[PDB]
Amino acid sequence: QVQLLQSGAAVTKPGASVRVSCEASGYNIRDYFIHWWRQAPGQGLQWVGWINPKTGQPNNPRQFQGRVSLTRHASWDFDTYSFYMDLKALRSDDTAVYFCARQRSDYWDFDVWGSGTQVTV
Amino acid sequence: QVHLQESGPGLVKPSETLSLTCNVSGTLVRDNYWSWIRQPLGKQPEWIGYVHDSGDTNYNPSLKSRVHLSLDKSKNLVSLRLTGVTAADSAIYYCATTKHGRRIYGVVAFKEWFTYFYMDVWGKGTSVTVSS
Amino acid sequence: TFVSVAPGQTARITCGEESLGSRSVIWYQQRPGQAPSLIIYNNNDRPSGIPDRFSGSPGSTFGTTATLTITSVEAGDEADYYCHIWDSRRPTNWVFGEGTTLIVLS
Amino acid sequence: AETTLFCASDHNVWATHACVPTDPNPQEIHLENVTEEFNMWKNNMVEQMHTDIISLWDQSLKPCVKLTPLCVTLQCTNVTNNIMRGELKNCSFNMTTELRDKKQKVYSLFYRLDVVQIKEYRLINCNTSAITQACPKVSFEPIPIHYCAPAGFAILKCKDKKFNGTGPCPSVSTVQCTHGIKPVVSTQLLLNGSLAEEEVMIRSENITNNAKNILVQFNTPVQINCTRPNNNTRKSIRIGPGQAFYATGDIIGDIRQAHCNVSKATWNETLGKVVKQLRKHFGNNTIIRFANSSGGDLEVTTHSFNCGGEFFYCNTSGLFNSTWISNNDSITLPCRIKQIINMWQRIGQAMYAPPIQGVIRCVSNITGLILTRDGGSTN
Amino acid sequence: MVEQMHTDIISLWDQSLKPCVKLTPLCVTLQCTNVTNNITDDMRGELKNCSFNMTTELRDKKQKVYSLFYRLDVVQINKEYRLINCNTSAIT
Ligand SMILES: *[C@@H]1O[C@H](CO)[C@@H](O[C@@H]2O[C@H](CO)[C@@H](O[C@@H]3O[C@H](CO[C@H]4O[C@H](CO)[C@@H](O)[C@H](O)[C@@H]4O)[C@@H](O)[C@H](O[C@H]4O[C@H](CO)[C@@H](O)[C@H](O)[C@@H]4O[C@H]4O[C@H](CO)[C@@H](O)[C@H](O)[C@@H]4O)[C@@H]3O)[C@H](O)[C@H]2NC(C)=O)[C@H](O)[C@H]1NC(C)=O
Ligand SMILES: *[C@@H]1O[C@H](CO)[C@@H](O[C@@H]2O[C@H](CO)[C@@H](O[C@@H]3O[C@H](CO[C@H]4O[C@H](CO)[C@@H](O)[C@H](O)[C@@H]4O)[C@@H](O)[C@H](O[C@H]4O[C@H](CO)[C@@H](O)[C@H](O)[C@@H]4O)[C@@H]3O)[C@H](O)[C@H]2NC(C)=O)[C@H](O)[C@H]1NC(C)=O
Ligand SMILES: *[C@@H]1O[C@H](CO)[C@@H](O[C@@H]2O[C@H](CO)[C@@H](O[C@@H]3O[C@H](CO)[C@@H](O)[C@H](O[C@H]4O[C@H](CO)[C@@H](O)[C@H](O)[C@@H]4O)[C@@H]3O)[C@H](O)[C@H]2NC(C)=O)[C@H](O)[C@H]1NC(C)=O
Ligand SMILES: *[C@@H]1O[C@H](CO)[C@@H](O[C@@H]2O[C@H](CO)[C@@H](O)[C@H](O)[C@H]2NC(C)=O)[C@H](O)[C@H]1NC(C)=O
Ligand SMILES: *[C@@H]1O[C@H](CO)[C@@H](O[C@@H]2O[C@H](CO)[C@@H](O)[C@H](O)[C@H]2NC(C)=O)[C@H](O)[C@H]1NC(C)=O
Ligand SMILES: *[C@@H]1O[C@H](CO)[C@@H](O[C@@H]2O[C@H](CO)[C@@H](O)[C@H](O)[C@H]2NC(C)=O)[C@H](O)[C@H]1NC(C)=O
Ligand SMILES: *[C@@H]1O[C@H](CO)[C@@H](O[C@@H]2O[C@H](CO)[C@@H](O)[C@H](O)[C@H]2NC(C)=O)[C@H](O)[C@H]1NC(C)=O
Ligand SMILES: *[C@@H]1O[C@H](CO)[C@@H](O[C@@H]2O[C@H](CO)[C@@H](O)[C@H](O)[C@H]2NC(C)=O)[C@H](O)[C@H]1NC(C)=O
Ligand SMILES: *[C@@H]1O[C@H](CO)[C@@H](O)[C@H](O)[C@H]1NC(C)=O
Ligand SMILES: *[C@@H]1O[C@H](CO)[C@@H](O)[C@H](O)[C@H]1NC(C)=O
Ligand SMILES: *[C@@H]1O[C@H](CO)[C@@H](O)[C@H](O)[C@H]1NC(C)=O
Ligand SMILES: *[C@@H]1O[C@H](CO)[C@@H](O)[C@H](O)[C@H]1NC(C)=O
Ligand SMILES: *[C@@H]1O[C@H](CO)[C@@H](O)[C@H](O)[C@H]1NC(C)=O
Ligand SMILES: *[C@@H]1O[C@H](CO)[C@@H](O)[C@H](O)[C@H]1NC(C)=O
Ligand SMILES: *[C@@H]1O[C@H](CO)[C@@H](O)[C@H](O)[C@H]1NC(C)=O
Ligand SMILES: *[C@@H]1O[C@H](CO)[C@@H](O)[C@H](O)[C@H]1NC(C)=O
Ligand SMILES: *[C@@H]1O[C@H](CO)[C@@H](O)[C@H](O)[C@H]1NC(C)=O
Ligand SMILES: *[C@@H]1O[C@H](CO)[C@@H](O)[C@H](O)[C@H]1NC(C)=O
């Protein structure tokens, strides 16, 4: 039962910050990366960045650099893994559905995705 | 040469502000660090803060809000106002001059140093007493 | 404290607590009925005009009390001695050290 | 094929007892007209070495004292100092005396990374794991080990220089076993390793992929020199019958921050070679930046390693801060020491590295880097 | 053969001592008097009647119990004693 349960939708004013949770369970979370994607209304998908669940190391592009903080929290006995994505300075262009997929193997084959969190600004 | 002359009331009541005024001859006030030292009779001296331009002042934590130092560049004078004096304040006062330094002991970029002051030359003396 | 030493002999003055860090001791000297006067700063660096007879223990040593050596003492050095201490691992001491009275037998 | 190999080691955590010593002279046979397809990413020797190193760590840590009573409430005042940041904490606590019915109020000097608040603090690992003190006599100095194949197997070495990590190797030799691998446990910079032959070598499993790290191998070493200038005197506290705990009792003066220096004149033009070899892959016109660190755990944001028995965590934000365009001063890296170590990314088995008396110094060789690209970068 | 025999004997001793119980609670403060033996002058203290609190099946409870310990087995800390090993090692 590979589950990537996300949090509820949030509405936030410009200049404030938001956090999106991606509570993960049902597999070896440490083995596979977690890639955050954002999809604007109507437009195609876009890459927010990946996080390694072992070392907590993120990797964001130049566009999202300095404004996205990808963190992970490991529960006791490694049963659940709450993956948080924090956006610092939201703008009008930041409204989107945020998904958090898992990278199963080196093909970047995202087989499990979160339900998606609608962030509106 | 540097000459320091201090003049004050001589006798001040308790809870009444004391104004001790020091005149320097030999160098300009803006070019040196000015210090005040109060020595109780039969005891050690006690540094009660120093004053300069650009707001470089640190006073004694005991006499934090009591003693205040001011400078007069045109007259070449330095004034001290001590508020709320008590019987323990009756002491000899000297108006001296500090030349700072830097005792470095580390990497410097990590702020592993401290600045130390010392009385290069001395004043004359003013044994201000308090009578209730 | 009181210390008495004959002329022409070394006198050792200890003032303040034990060392704890990189310490800078400034040794003053107050004559009777006179203002204090600098004789040593930075534990060895005498100011201009002061005699070179005086010396001080270096601040690089840890756990040792500050020591002022006065070799070949004369009548002029019969006076008080207050040491101002600047330790890196101690906040600023706005009160001078416990004075020591050097008394010459003459 | 894959097979288990043994050491050839010439007190340490990397025990030389339960595997054979070295041959007096290596036997190297140059196989002429042989072109074998190597692939270091699917190499099983790496996995066997990782498992062996973990096993040696476990067998070294196993017959030594468990610090079970230390997870208690700690009255932690700041250590005597004038100051910005109180890194060292003077923590007092009730500890079990060798008699079970008696207690002793003792104190220690912990680090800020080892204690979390609840003035009442507690050790960082009380929530997640049990703790085992490392043995004071046992040293963490890396020692060379050569992994040698059993009978019926052979080890092929690629003597060809300029060798990419994957693909055919025109110059193959067979060796009985390897050189001194010297297992240094470090992040963000490879220390004490092979120094290449011709030019800086960039190796990654897929260059296009970001998710996979980039291993850079240097020509000449970059000398890095550390100091923990604090004294950090050690004192023994008998926490039970035959069980002793080594605490930082006091510090002789100048509480100073630990640091490792790199030369600026060497690290510059070392990064010059690195950006030249990287522009060899990403085109001859792209500007190549180096940035601080993306983020993550403390072991990854900081160049973490073991110097002289103490675990350093150097910032290295001044090293990797450069922009490169196509056309005796030292970089001082402030490091943070830590005693509660969770090695091999394992939760459940922590470790208390004891204090080392006196001052400690690194003089080590940076012989490589680990990097990760930033992703994105469409055109 | 001597070295191998010695190593085998020590390992047999350790293997026999492994599954047995650990007496870490026994390192406590013991009130020791003399066992009733008239007054034998010297060699009177060779057996000491020592009382101590011991743990029970329930961790929250203790019990006052007594036992006869030899003089060589104990060391004084006038009546407070402890087992001689309590600073050097642990007993199985
Ligand atoms: C990584 O790279 C950095 C940068 O290069 C480097 O930082 C350096 O750290 C050292 C310590 O490791 C610092 O050295 C101190 O420097 C001061 C200042 O020395 C200068 O100025 C004096 C004149 O005031 C000159 O004579 C001198 O040549 C220098 O120009 C000194 O105060 C220090 O020495 C005293 O303190 C030590 C600690 O107690 C004592 O052991 C020593 O004997 C000295 O005490 C004596 O002198 C005192 C004078 O005030 C006196 O009061 C005492 O009684 C006693 O007689 C000390 O040497 C240096 O400042 C840093 N340099 C820079 C450029 O930042 C790191 O070390 C390096 N790390 C590695 C691993 O390489
Ligand atoms: C023990 O620790 C204390 C506390 O940290 C140190 O005292 C400090 O000493 C430094 C260095 O002299 C002082 O900094 C100086 O202050 C001036 C500004 O002061 C204002 O701001 C501070 C707080 O920021 C207030 O406390 C103060 O009242 C004022 O409002 C600046 O003018 C100074 O810069 C100039 O001087 C230095 C050296 O003289 C030069 O390097 C500079 O370039 C420049 O010329 C300077 O920043 C600081 O204010 C002191 N703090 C306090 C609380 O008094 C002790 O030095 C230290 N002692 C030992 C023995 O280790
Ligand atoms: C990369 O390799 C270099 C060498 O190629 C290596 O430098 C070595 O570091 C060690 C560890 O700090 C140094 O050994 C120490 O040196 C001094 C002087 O002899 C002593 O204080 C030490 O002895 C004490 O510590 C030992 C360890 O617990 C105890 O066994 C011993 O009984 C003492 O208590 C110790 O010998 C060594 O001098 C250097 N240099 C060499 C070998 O040339 C460096 O550390 C390596 N880098 C990494 C990250 O591993
Ligand atoms: C055990 O305790 C640590 C702290 O000692 C917990 O880590 C904290 O997690 C909380 C979660 O809300 C964060 O606010 C803190 O930022 C974390 N720690 C620190 C040191 O800043 C850890 O999650 C706990 N482990 C459990 C409950 O399994
Ligand atoms: C850590 O704190 C302890 C608190 O006890 C300090 O130990 C005291 O040090 C003072 C120094 O003047 C002595 O008078 C006391 O007797 C000491 N108490 C005990 C119980 O030993 C200790 O010095 C502190 N250490 C540091 C490095 O700050
Ligand atoms: C990235 O480098 C910058 C400095 O170039 C560091 O960012 C600072 O971090 C501190 C500590 O969290 C903050 O108080 C500052 O506000 C930050 N400055 C800026 C300009 O953002 C950062 O620490 C480096 N990253 C790592 C992992 O070391
Ligand atoms: C690593 O070093 C960098 C560079 O010194 C630190 O970034 C500075 O942090 C201070 C506060 O500690 C800020 O005021 C500066 O603005 C930062 N930026 C600079 C100098 O460019 C960084 O904090 C250090 N990292 C950690 C984790 O301590
Ligand atoms: C060892 O001492 C214990 C007391 O600590 C003795 O036990 C008592 O013996 C008397 C004998 O008259 C009984 O009446 C008590 O009820 C016993 N009290 C207890 C068990 O708490 C014991 O006899 C002594 N053993 C010797 C001298 O061999
Ligand atoms: C102790 O250190 C903490 C953390 O830096 C600081 O907030 C506090 O003011 C310090 N207390 C004293 C008495 O120095
Ligand atoms: C140690 O135990 C005593 C028991 O009365 C308690 O009052 C004290 O606070 C404890 N000290 C610590 C935890 O440092
Ligand atoms: C290794 O890199 C070199 C230099 O770019 C390249 O020519 C070679 O094909 C690479 N190896 C493989 C197996 O692709
Ligand atoms: C590192 O230390 C060695 C040995 O003391 C010295 O020769 C070298 O110059 C140092 N290098 C630095 C500080 O970069
Ligand atoms: C490093 O060298 C390059 C030229 O190769 C120069 O542009 C750059 O400023 C240097 N950086 C340093 C010394 O930090
Ligand atoms: C990065 O390098 C530039 C140029 O030397 C310098 O101004 C800047 O402060 C450096 N950043 C850090 C964090 O050291
Ligand atoms: C550290 O302290 C010891 C105390 O015995 C002293 O001998 C040693 O010199 C100190 N270290 C340094 C570098 O001064
Ligand atoms: C660093 O590299 C030089 C040159 O290869 C070598 O001679 C030296 O032993 C190395 N030092 C180490 C590994 O500490
Ligand atoms: C009996 O026990 C006491 C302690 O209670 C001991 O000091 C003494 O030597 C023993 N012998 C006699 C004869 O009292
Ligand atoms: C045993 O426990 C009781 C409980 O009240 C205590 O008074 C007594 O001193 C203890 N005796 C020993 C030998 O520990």
Author numbering:
A (entry chain H): 1 to 121
B (entry chain J): 1 to 82, 82A, 82B, 82C, 83 to 100, 100A, 100B, 100C, ...
C (entry chain K): 5 to 6, 11 to 66, 66A, 66B, 66C, 67 to 95, 95A, 95B, ...
D (entry chain A): 48 to 57, 66 to 138, 150 to 184, 189 to 309, 312 to 323, 323A, 324 to 398, 411 to 462
E (entry chain E): 100 to 141, 150 to 184, 188 to 202
Question: What text comes from the article?
Answer:
The human immunodeficiency virus-1 (HIV-1) envelope glycoprotein (Env) trimer is the sole target for virus-neutralizing antibodies (NAbs) and, therefore, is a major focus of vaccine research. HIV-1 Env, a class I fusion protein, is synthesized as a gp160 precursor protein, which is then oligomerized, extensively glycosylated, and cleaved by the host protease furin to form pre-fusion trimers composed of three gp120 and gp41 subunits. The function of the pre-fusion trimer is to engage with cell surface receptors (CD4 followed by CCR5 or CXCR4), and then undergo conformational rearrangements that drive virus-cell fusion. The initial, and most commonly used, design of stabilized trimers is referred to as SOSIP. These trimers contain an engineered disulfide bond between Env positions 501 and 605 that covalently links the gp120 and gp41 ectodomain subunits, and an I559P substitution in gp41 that reduces the propensity to adopt the unwanted post-fusion conformation.
